[PDB]
């Protein structure tokens, strides 16, 4: 339920697998350094037009072994 806000650069988009690979900036809320992670698109994810290399602002939740995207857009 904790919504986590982050920023990063998009490294790959695979909608077939429902994955956006993001090299994210440190996330203080969860004590994460910069990482590269795949973030999962759900049917309810608020998607904007994004492409590889885009600087993005996004929100996610940790659920199961997945990082579920709430929203993502070019920052």
Binding interface with Cu ion (CB under 5 A): 32, 35, 37
Number of neighbours of residue 40 by Cβ within 10 angstroms: 17
Distance CA 25, CA 33 (A): 7
Q: What's the closest the beta carbon of residue 11 comes to Cu ion, in angstroms? A: 13
30 burial (CB, 10 Å; 0-12 / 13-18 / 19+) is: exposed
User: Please, which residue, 45 or 58, has the CB nearer to Cu ion?
Assistant: 58
User: Please, which residue, 30 or 74, has the CB nearer to Cu ion?
Assistant: 30
Tell me, what DSSP letter sits at residue 75? -
User: Please, which residue, 49 or 70, has the CB nearer to Cu ion?
Assistant: 70
Q: What's the closest the beta carbon of residue 35 comes to Cu ion, in angstroms? A: 4
């Amino acid at each position: 339920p904790q919504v986590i806000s982050a920023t990063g650069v998009v490294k790959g988009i695979d909608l077939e697998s429902k994955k956006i690979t993001i090299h994210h900036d440190p996330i203080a809320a969860v004590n994460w350094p910069e990482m590269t992670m795949r973030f999962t698109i759900t049917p309810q994810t608020k998607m904007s037009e994004i492409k590889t290399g885009d600087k993005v602002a996004f929100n996610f939740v940790q659920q199961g072994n997945l990082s579920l995207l709430q929203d993502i857009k070019v920052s």
